Design a protein around this nucleic acid. Structure first.
Ligand SMILES: [Mg+2]
Ligand SMILES: [Zn+2]
Ligand SMILES: [Zn+2]
Ligand SMILES: [Zn+2]
Lengths: 159, 65, 84, 196, 158, 559, 263, 114, 43, 141, 133
RNA sequence: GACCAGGCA
DNA sequence: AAATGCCTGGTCT
């Protein structure tokens, strides 16, 4: 691998280093192996990085990952953007999918979930257990044809 | 469908040269190339006009009514 | 749940979205034959006018900034700085 | 479109004069932008022109059959014998000015198709017409004078622009708009409206 | 060393270099105190938050650390004097300038980042269409779904 | 999904689009007929009656006219039928549904709309013929091209609504996009391809034209600038006049590979006081790049000033090119005779290498690298061998290409084309591939019934040696076809799969926004980021700057 | 005489190759264009169809009629219908021709332009005559009929110009070259080796002296001398296209002069 | 269906005069003359002649949009010299040369056989 | 019309890929884009 | 007289096929640099020879000139568009009453043909015109 | 109303790197070995070659819209053949007892190296370049 | 309602 | 449980 490194004289130089790439994962046991620098061991399997190093790390890889997907294509995307994603994917202490199994369960009002994959059902299990929708989601005010907490509807205007 | 009156491109009347052209082919036993030039059709805008035409009307006339 | 004019932490500067709604709402009043608090250098379009009522801080409108808890802060178009 | 996967709509028509012209006085029936070529690697197109040119000239059917020994050379060789630059370029003068064009141009005949789907057959444009009886929402298709779909995706954009008001005005004041009366105790549309 | 940060300082400078017609032949009227203390002071009026309490006053410091680093490395005594012969006037301007710009680079409450981001990732994604790993759409899909059966696992040791 | 969050709205219009070089970036050409249909409820006011009444008199079938007149009671006077349609005395307070006029703000979008940029507000410009006409540099944000795309237009109905479009969603306002934190609109096709030529040192212009070019720029200060040359003939350079387009106060330093404040290669870029000092103008300068003359001009002079920058640069450069001309033909794909020689044999050795590997492998002499089948290693070699071959025959071709070669000529501007295109059109096309592997044995142990079983030689497995110029051979054809297909297919797939992802992302974050305490929370209020993007800075107002304190020797940090 | 001066080389009923020298390129062109687009002419601009048992469509036939060249010498004394105070048309602003053709024989009857029949009163002006340059004298092949097919038309030829429509162009094609050797350097030829061996040599070179090797670049010279040739559809004799061309352009100019005046 | 009638290319409509003369505002002794239902043919010819007058400091022209047939001629002349005059002269000098060409051609055309 | 009369449809491991054996029997190029690409063939 | 046979993909498996007869059955005893490069007739086994490779194509692609000097997918696009082209779909279009019919006023046989268009009756019922085209940057329109 | 630099130069090399109307000239100075010159010249309007004796001049005189003839019988800093106008951008310390400068004539470039010019050379836009024989 | 065909991507 | 967006058109129960 190629790694820039501060030289005694100050400038960054290129000190190539041997690195082992693997075709199989088991993080938990490899760090412990001697000789390797457990400080840097890595894996594209964020889940594993989660279970082993904590979630704050998982978020990291989760991004480190997404990023690579987008940059391997020469394309760039400002941090913040992906950041937000990963974070939104990482605030609930675990790895929450962008699938229905993840964010539609979220704790949100019924209507939001309505606009995504399990309407019918979502509205039943919602009626059964009398859920009260704040009506503060943009997706719901859209259903009721009212302004929403968007740029124009965050601040109120008065005389 | 009938010989275009005048060339799309430049406007040189051409519809008055179809029969002339045909004859030059059949009887004068000439090659499409010279036949054209003899009819005064010297530029290609005016040569494709006749050379490419597909006189379909002759087939539409065989339809009785 | 209100917040005194003091202890005010929100941005002194007016957000684009706030000014676009302020601009719209005044432009609309102006379009409804409402008094104009400015001198027209020869303007006719409500909005274009309303823009000039703001450029001369003469738009009697106040913005109520709700925080995420429920409280809020009332800022007046006279206070708010319009850089943008 | 040509015969090489290169389609295009007309963008303007110019009368003979405004058109660039050949010293011979020949002018093009059509002009395509050089930029629609490097990437599409549709070379045959170019070739076909070389060929169709020579052909029209010598009144010979041009043979652009696939696997043959027909070369771009053999052709360019033929076109020169015909007093033309062996590649298809031909000095041309700018119609407006009459001056010469600093860049010679690829000029020749090329078989072009007239595809169906013509603007006028598409120009739909509605401003509140007939609405569906079931949803009270604008009808589909233009043959019926319907409305355009401001679907999910367009909405997200508006949300992204932070234009709250517009959104409401789109998803309401235009299309669905209805006044309902509700019971201030059981938020159900079970209130008998007797307006008088 | 190249990272996206608000306020292209380099520019402001160039925009003083010729707005005050600065001659690289005569000496500046800058006091070492002026520069040094000025640069410092500038760092007090950037702000992104305005609570008067500890916690928030510390966040505010965080959210500015980096930019400031940029700022300090750029507006350094030698530099100011030796690199771009500013003058008390130009320099003094450059400061008042940065402040304002900074304040202009702040996000506006209302900005719907949720979507703004979702799309910022979805778009360049629909531009993807094709050294033996799982990349592109499939992988991105692998990720977002939080799959456990990833095709190209791997562990990279050092 | 299709009735509540996605409805069919009124006051919408759709047609084919085509580019129009004499339309401003932020406008949109609305075909008279469409304008005569779409309307706008304007209330009667002393600041307008004259115009309003005048229009009502013009009626629904002459452009600056109207349809419908709304009154106090809420009645609709239909202006096309109505014994009293040639009467009607407008009353303050009434409403006159008028046609869409010039300068109205309208939301114009192309689908799929996976951006904000896919929907933008444009100033209306009613014009003849029936296609929406749009400025070219508005092309990319909507990802349109004019091979047939249709586009949708929506008209604001409320005075607010309009404001919301003209103040937030206006095309000007969107030049520097927050996603890539760089601009999202550059200069393309002719204007780009040309601007470069127009710039070459070798490029000079004289009086008659100069005077036209200058005039052509609408914001011209009518002050003819002094010629770069005053000797035997007063000649201006390209840069000279283009610089007229660039406003004052714009500065821009560049430095490409061999730049040196004397750029012998007319390299890099140096713009001072809105005057171009050195460097050819192409994509890097005027493209939609980060450093770009556009990123700088937007940030410095204002969105609008920069909006104008486009038309100006265009109007000038376009005109200049309209008179210089530019084209391409087969000729442009023909390579030096001795070159094709050097190329054909360049391949000739690649084949021998593959062959020499092959025999080695068949002797079992090969040493299998770790983790790979001696078989895997074999394949990988040949594939590498052949790729290089293609790339060098290609490079070999790229060098011939004289600066006068139009293809190369576009590639240099960065207006279309890339090595690959040349390399394939001119020298060897390449090794075809399906599923990341070289063509398979669909038949038993063979590629086609025209080969003998067991034959891993390049020809046999998909290596198209010829060029698109020379022409492919049946087998080559068929092969190249297989890959061709693989492409078209995942093409259809990579679209749906992505379309789906585009949504899950959008739903997932949908409701997240930067609140009034600079925090970032979703509907619930649950904080997601304590400061947006961790610096509470807006993506658009950002740019790649260098932290001068990280690099350099310790000595240099001190010096 | 004064400036602008010609030198006809060739000449006939249809063409007029000639050298136009000591003029500005701007003019050489303005002239060229005008010839192509603003010289008036008579042409069918309205077809009244009574019967069409043909294989061709009405408007399809009508289109071709319009394209058929008609005499136009005395067009200068025929008015624009839009200016004639008549309701629609008359013999002061138009020329009405009749076309009647019946498939008689079972041997396909052809319909030529020679069959149009002027019905209106020409008023003794040479105008509206199916122009015929055929050898056999059958100007243009309009249509063909079968056993018993009918075609009964009535056209109204009006004054018009290439601008409203190309059918009204008298010019056809105009050659035009200047500075046969690129001494003026108004172009930069595209080459593969020798731009001189690859690019042809125009007849027009023979009428001009070469570049003289080591001679510097003539940076002050402009474009003088132009080698043109006007082909002519024939509704107008070639000499006229050139004249009437020159005339028209000249009138166009005058009307702006007259403009300032009324201003 | 949205196509304009061809005649609108050479026929002034209602409220359209062949010329409009507004005083340029950027320069002195400058004037922008807009022409109606006229294209390159005139525009460029007059622009070229207008550049033979040594008391002419500037002169360009443009058809702002092909759709419409109209153009703008800009003129700046030496103090005391009215461009309108600078315009007059030009049109004349033009007509004169034209007449000339008309004759000389007609002359030659007559010495011709065929 | 000719092309319609010489068409092929395949309802429902890799079936839209142009396949070796197809040589000689089905047109390598002619096939619709997206949707049913590779499924609808042409002899 | 057994000079030809009907082979299906299954039997195809067991045969060796020469592409061009000529170019593939002469004995190897200077080469035009502009002609594409072909390998060799290495096979003392040929049991069959292709009637003609151009036959691997079908109706649609058959009308493409030089589709062997064209990038793979562009050939597929054209094949899909040749079906949206106008022209005379039948000499009796006038006697047929059907939902929409588009006919070209002056159809032209292409100056550039294919030895396989003779069977597809293209020259007889052409769909397209032979326009004089110029690839050039003009008004920028 | 001034003049800012005079000096005869001897052209050592003439380079036409892929340009047909421009060559980048590098001529040394006769007299003071310290002075050297790098310039872009339109070889189409003003040929040059192997070892020529070139007279150079700078100044800033004989910014209001440009006019052309008439004065063909007026002012005339036409005592030369070739002449250009430009804007100078950077003054550099070649270090030592030498100093250089950079001018851009609408893209045609020039770098001048010497030292006594600290005074005689301007510091602004104005800058004509005159050459003769 | 069933259904397939097509345009852009 | 879900499987791009939008757009036009044509046939049959
Ligand atoms: Mg497209
Ligand atoms: Zn012609
Ligand atoms: Zn109730
Ligand atoms: Zn009359």
């Amino acid at each position: 691998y190629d790694r820039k490194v501060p030289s005694p004289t100050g400038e960054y130089v290129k000190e190539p280093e041997w690195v082992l790439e693997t075709d199989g994962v088991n993080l938990s046991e490899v760090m412990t192996v001697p000789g390797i620098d457990p400080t840097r061991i890595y894996t594209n399997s964020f889940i594993d990085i989660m279970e082993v190093l904590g979630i704050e790390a998982g978020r990291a890889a989760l991004y480190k990952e997404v990023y690579n997907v987008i940059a391997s294509d020469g394309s760039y995307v400002n941090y913040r953007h992906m950041a937000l994603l990963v974070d939104v994917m990482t605030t609930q202490g675990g790895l929450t999918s962008v699938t229905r199994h993840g964010f539609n369960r979220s704790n949100t009002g019924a209507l939001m979930r309505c606009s995504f994959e399990e309407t019918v059902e979502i509205l039943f299990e919602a009626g059964a257990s009398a859920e009260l929708d704040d009506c503060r989601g943009v997706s719901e005010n859209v259903i009721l044809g009212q302004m929403a907490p968007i740029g124009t509807g965050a601040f109120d205007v008065m005389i | 469908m009938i010989v275009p009156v005048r060339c799309f491109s430049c406007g040189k009347v051409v519809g008055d040269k179809w029969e002339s052209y045909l004859n030059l082919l059949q009887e004068d036993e000439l090659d499409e190339g010279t036949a054209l030039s003899r009819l005064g059709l010297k530029r290609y805008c005016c040569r494709r006009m006749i050379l490419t035409h597909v006189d379909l009307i002759e087939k539409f006339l065989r339809y009785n009514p | 749940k209100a917040i005194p004019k003091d202890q005010r932490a929100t941005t002194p500067y007016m957000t684009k979205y706030e000014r676009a709604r302020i601009l719209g709402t005044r432009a609309l009043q102006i379009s409804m034959n409402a008094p104009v608090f400015v001198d027209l250098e020869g303007e006719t379009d409500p909005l274009r006018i309303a823009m000039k009522e703001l450029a001369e801080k003469k738009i009697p409108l106040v913005i109520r900034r709700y925080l995420p808890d429920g409280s809020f802060e009332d800022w007046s178009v006279e206070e708010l700085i319009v850089d943008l | 479109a040509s015969r090489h996967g290169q389609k295009g709509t007309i963008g303007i028509t110019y009368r003979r004069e405004d058109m660039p012209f050949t010293a011979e006085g020949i002018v093009p029936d059509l002009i395509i932008n050089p930029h629609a070529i490097p990437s599409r690697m549709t070379v045959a197109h170019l070739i076909e022109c070389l060929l169709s040119k020579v052909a029209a000239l010598s009144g010979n059917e041009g043979d652009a059959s696939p696997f043959t020994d027909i070369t771009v050379e053999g052709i360019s060789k033929l076109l020169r014998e015909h007093g033309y630059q062996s590649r298809g370029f031909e000095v041309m003068y700018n119609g407006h000015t009459g001056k010469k064009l600093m860049a010679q141009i690829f000029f020749g005949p090329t078989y072009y198709q007239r595809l169906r789907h013509m603007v006028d057959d598409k120009i739909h444009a509605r401003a509140r017409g007939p609405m569906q009886v079931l949803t009270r929402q604008p009808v589909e298709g233009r043959s019926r004078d319907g409305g355009l779909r401001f679907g999910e995706m367009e909405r997200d954009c508006m949300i992204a622009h932070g234009a709250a008001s517009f959104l409401k005005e789109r998803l309401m004041e235009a299309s669905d708009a209805f006044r309902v009366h509700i019971c201030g105790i059981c938020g159900l549309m079970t209130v008998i409206a007797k307006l008088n | 060393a190249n990272w996206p940060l608000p306020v292209n300082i380099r520019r402001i400078i160039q925009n003083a270099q010729q707005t005050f017609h600065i001659d690289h032949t005569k000496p500046s009227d800058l006091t070492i105190k002026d520069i040094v203390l000025g640069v410092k002071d500038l760092q007090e009026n950037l702000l992104v938050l305005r609570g008067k309490n500890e916690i928030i006053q510390n966040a505010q410091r965080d959210a500015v650390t980096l930019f400031c680093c940029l700022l300090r490395s750029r507006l350094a005594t030698r530099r100011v004097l030796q690199e771009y012969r500013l003058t008390k006037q130009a320099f003094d301007w450059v400061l008042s300038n940065i402040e304002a710009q900074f304040l202009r680079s702040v996000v506006h409450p209302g900005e719907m980042v949720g979507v703004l981001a979702a799309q910022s990732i979805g778009e360049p994604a629909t531009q993807m269409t094709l050294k033996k790993v799982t990349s592109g759409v499939p992988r991105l899909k692998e990720i977002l779904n939080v799959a456990k059966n990833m095709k190209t696992p791997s562990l990279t040791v050092y | 999904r299709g009735n509540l969050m996605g409805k069919r709205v009124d006051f919408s219009a759709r047609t084919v689009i085509s580019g129009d070089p004499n339309l401003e970036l932020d406008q949109v050409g609305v075909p008279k007929s469409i304008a005569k249909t779409l309307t706008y409820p304007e209330v009667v006011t002393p600041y307008n009656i004259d115009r309003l009444t005048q229009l009502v008199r013009n009626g629904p079938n002459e452009h600056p006219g109207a349809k419908y007149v709304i009154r106090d009671s809420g009645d609709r006077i239909d202006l096309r039928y109505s014994k009293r349609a040639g009467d009607i005395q407008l009353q303050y307070g009434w409403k006159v549904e008028r046609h869409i006029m010039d300068n109205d703000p309208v939301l114009f979008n192309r689908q799929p709309s996976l951006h904000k940029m896919s929907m933008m507000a444009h100033r209306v410009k009613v014009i003849p013929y029936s296609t929406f006409r749009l400025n070219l540099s508005v092309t990319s944000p909507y990802n349109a091209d004019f091979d047939g795309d249709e586009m949708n237009l929506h008209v604001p109905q409320s005075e607010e609504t309009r404001a919301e479009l003209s103040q937030l969603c206006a095309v000007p306002l969107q030049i520097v996009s927050p996603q890539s934190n760089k601009p999202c609109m550059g200069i393309v096709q002719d204007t780009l391809c040309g601007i470069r030529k127009l710039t070459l040192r070798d490029t000079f212009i004289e009086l008659d034209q100069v005077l036209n070019m200058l005039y052509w720029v609408p914001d011209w200060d009518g002050v003819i600038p002094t010629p770069a040359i005053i000797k035997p003939k007063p000649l201006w350079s390209g840069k000279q006049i283009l610089s007229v387009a660039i406003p004052n106060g714009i500065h821009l330093q560049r430095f490409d590979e061999g730049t040196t404040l004397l750029s012998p290669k007319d390299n890099g870029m140096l713009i001072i006081d809105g005057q171009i000092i050195f460097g050819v103008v192409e994509k890097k300068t005027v493209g939609s790049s980060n450093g770009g003359l556009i990123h700088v001009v937007t940030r410095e002079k204002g969105p609008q000033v920069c909006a104008k920058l486009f038309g100006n640069i265009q109007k000038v450069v376009n005109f200049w090119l309209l008179h210089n001309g530019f084209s391409t033909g087969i000729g442009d794909t023909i390579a030096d005779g001795p070159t094709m020689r050097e190329i054909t044999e360049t391949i000739a050795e690649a084949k021998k290498k593959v062959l020499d590997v092959t025999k080695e492998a068949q002797a079992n002499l090969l040493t299998a690298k770790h983790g790979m089948t001696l078989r895997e290693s074999f394949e990988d070699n040949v594939v590498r061998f052949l790729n290089e071959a293609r790339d060098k025959a290609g490079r070999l071709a790229e060098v011939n290409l004289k600066d006068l070669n139009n293809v190369k000529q576009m590639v240099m501007a960065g207006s279309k084309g890339s090595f690959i295109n040349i390399a394939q059109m001119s020298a060897c096309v390449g090794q075809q591939s399906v599923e990341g592997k070289r063509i398979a044995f669909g038949f038993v142990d063979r590629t086609l019934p025209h080969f003998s079983k067991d034959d891993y030689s390049p020809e046999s497995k998909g290596f198209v040696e010829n060029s698109y110029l020379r022409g492919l051979t049946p087998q080559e054809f068929f092969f190249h076809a297989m890959g061709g297909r693989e492409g078209l297919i995942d093409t259809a797939v990579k679209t749906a799969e992505t379309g789906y992802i585009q949504r899950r992302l959008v739903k997932a974050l949908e409701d997240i926004m930067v609140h009034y305490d600079n925090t970032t929370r979703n509907s619930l209020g649950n904080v997601i980021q304590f400061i947006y993007g961790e610096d509470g800075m807006d993506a658009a107002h950002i740019e790649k700057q260098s932290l001068d304190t990280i690099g350099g020797s310790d000595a240099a940090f001190e010096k | 005489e004064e400036g602008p001066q010609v030198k006809i080389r060739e000449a006939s009923k249809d063409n007029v190759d000639f050298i136009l020298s000591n003029v500005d390129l701007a003019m050489a062109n303005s002239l060229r264009r005008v010839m192509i687009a603003e010289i008036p002419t008579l042409a069918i601009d309205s077809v009244e169809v009574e019967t069409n048992t043909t294989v061709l469509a009405d408007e399809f036939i009508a289109h071709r009629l319009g394209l058929i060249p008609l005499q136009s010498m005395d067009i200068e004394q025929l008015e624009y219908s839009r200016d004639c105070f008549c309701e629609d048309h008359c013999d002061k602003c138009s020329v009405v021709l009749t076309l009647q053709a019946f498939g008689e024989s079972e041997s396909t009857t052809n319909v030529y332009s020679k069959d149009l029949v002027i019905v209106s009163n020409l008023m003794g002006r040479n105008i509206g005559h199916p122009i015929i340059q055929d050898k056999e004298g059958n100007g243009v092949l309009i249509c063909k009929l079968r056993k018993g097919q009918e075609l009964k038309l009535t056209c109204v030829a009006k004054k018009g110009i290439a601008k409203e429509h190309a059918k009204w162009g008298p010019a056809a094609a105009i050659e035009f070259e200047y500075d046969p050797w690129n001494k003026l350097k108004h172009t930069d030829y595209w080459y593969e080796q020798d731009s001189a061996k690859e690019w042809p040599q125009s007849k027009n070179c023979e009428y001009e002296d070469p570049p003289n090797e080591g001679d510097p670049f003539d940076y002050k010279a402009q474009a003088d001398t132009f080698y043109m040739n006007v082909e002519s559809v024939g509704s107008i004799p070639v000499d006229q296209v050139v004249v009437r061309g020159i005339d028209t352009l000249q009138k166009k100019v005058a009307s702006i002069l007259l403009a300032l005046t009324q201003m | 269906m949205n196509a304009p009638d061809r005649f609108e290319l050479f026929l002034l409509g209602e409220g359209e005069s062949k010329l409009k003369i507004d005083p340029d505002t950027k320069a002195p002794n400058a004037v922008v003359i807009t022409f109606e239902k006229e294209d390159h043919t005139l525009g460029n010819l007059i622009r070229a002649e207008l550049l033979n007058d040594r008391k002419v400091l500037f002169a360009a022209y443009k058809v702002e949009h092909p759709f419409f047939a109209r153009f703008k001629l800009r003129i700046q002349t030496t103090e005391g010299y009215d461009p309108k005059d600078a315009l007059k002269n030009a049109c004349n000098s033009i007509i004169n040369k034209l007449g000339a060409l008309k004759t000389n051609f007609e002359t030659e055309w007559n010495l011709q056989t065929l | 019309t000719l092309s319609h009369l010489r068409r092929t449809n395949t309802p429902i491991a890799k079936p839209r890929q142009l396949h070796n054996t197809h040589w000689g029997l089905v047109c390598p190029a002619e096939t619709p884009e997206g949707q049913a690409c590779g499924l609808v063939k042409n002899l | 007289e057994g000079l030809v046979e009907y082979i299906d993909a299954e039997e195809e498996e067991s045969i060796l096929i020469a592409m061009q007869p000529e170019d593939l059955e002469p004995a190897e005893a200077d080469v035009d640099p502009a002609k594409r490069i072909r390998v060799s007739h290495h096979a003392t086994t040929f049991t069959h020879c292709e009637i003609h490779p151009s036959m691997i194509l079908g109706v649609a692609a058959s009308i493409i000139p030089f589709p062997d000097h064209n990038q793979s997918p562009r050939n597929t696009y054209q094949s899909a568009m040749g079906k949206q082209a106008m022209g005379v779909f039948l000499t009796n279009y006038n006697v047929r009453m059907d939902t929409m019919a588009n006919i070209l006023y002056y159809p032209q046989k292409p100056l550039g043909t294919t030895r396989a268009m003779e069977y597809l009756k293209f020259r007889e019922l052409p769909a397209g015109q032979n326009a004089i085209v110029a690839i050039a940057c003009y008004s920028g329109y | 109303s001034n003049t800012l630099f005079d000096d005869i130069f001897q052209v050592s090399e003439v380079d036409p790197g892929r340009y047909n109307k421009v060559c980048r000239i590098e001529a040394a100075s006769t007299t003071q070995d310290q002075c050297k010159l790098t310039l872009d010249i339109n070889v189409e309007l003003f040929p040059v070659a192997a070892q020529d004796s070139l007279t150079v001049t700078i100044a800033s005189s004989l910014t209001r819209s440009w006019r052309p003839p008439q004065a063909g019988d007026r002012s005339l800093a036409d005592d030369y053949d070739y002449v250009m106008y430009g804007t100078a951008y950077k003054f550099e310390e070649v270090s030592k007892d030498l100093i250089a400068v950079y001018y851009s004539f609408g893209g045609l470039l020039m770098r001048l190296e010497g030292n006594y010019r600290n005074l005689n050379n301007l510091k602004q836009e104005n800058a004509y370049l005159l050459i003769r024989r």
